[PDB]
Amino acid sequence: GCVXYPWC
């Protein structure tokens, strides 16, 4: 759940 994906 890395808010920013697919480009974190």
XYZ file of C-alpha atoms in Angstrom:
8
model
C 0.000 0.000 0.000
C 2.796 2.411 -0.886
C 0.851 5.514 -1.916
C 2.730 6.549 -5.042
C 2.997 3.260 -6.920
C 3.770 1.995 -9.304
C 6.353 4.770 -8.993
C 7.003 5.172 -5.268
